[PDB]
């Protein structure tokens, strides 16, 4: 549930489907196919 | 008809004047009464810094300047003319604020 909260806020970053950039210290995340 | 004060702030003099000067004609074409455009003094945001990221070389300081310019006008117009004059002024780069 401590992970389900973020997993459900979105709608680990190395399994796939998650592109992460830094772009001035804010850890931008994007979900992809 | 209501009394309003229009404030323009910017760094780009060309657009700042291109806005503050069409406002005068926009008022005159409707034949309004207004106090002239007042130019509050341009303030320089000059800040000095050291050029190199380390401590070698002769002590050379370089300053960066951000010149902020800003004017203000008093006008008397109904709500319809007020919304019109605040809607035409969407020029990107000049901040416009209307107070009543």
């Amino acid at each position: 549930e401590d992970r389900n909260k973020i997993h459900q806020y979105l709608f680990l970053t190395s399994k796939g489907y998650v592109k992460t950039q830094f772009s001035w210290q804010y850890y931008y995340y994007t979900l992809t196919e | 008809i209501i009394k309003i004060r229009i404030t323009l702030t910017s760094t780009k003099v060309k657009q700042l004047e291109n806005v503050s000067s069409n406002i005068v004609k926009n008022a005159e074409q409707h034949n309004l009464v207004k106090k002239g455009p007042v130019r509050l003094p341009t303030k320089v945001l000059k800040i000095s810094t050291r050029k190199t990221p380390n401590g070698e070389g002769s002590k050379t300081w370089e300053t960066y300047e951000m010149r902020i310019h800003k004017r203000y006008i008093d006008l008397e117009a109904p709500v319809q003319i007020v919304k019109r004059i605040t809607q035409i002024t969407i020029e990107p780069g000049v901040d416009v604020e209307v107070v009543v």
């Binding site: - | 800040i47 810094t49 050029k51 010149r67």
Partner: protein, 49 residues
């Protein structure tokens, strides 16, 4: 666990490099003196005199 760091260089850092040194806490920048010099003209700070 964590002792308070509500002041000082543990409180403030460059929003770019996270460096505690060279921080410009002027005009609301909160950015380092070297990142400032690099990405200065993109903020509006021009070199005029």
């Amino acid at each position: 666990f964590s002792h308070p760091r509500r002041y000082g260089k543990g409180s403030r850092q460059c929003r770019v490099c996270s460096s505690h040194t060279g921080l410009i806490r002027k005009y609301g920048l909160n950015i380092c003196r070297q990142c400032f010099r690099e990405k200065a003209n993109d903020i509006g700070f021009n070199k005029f005199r």
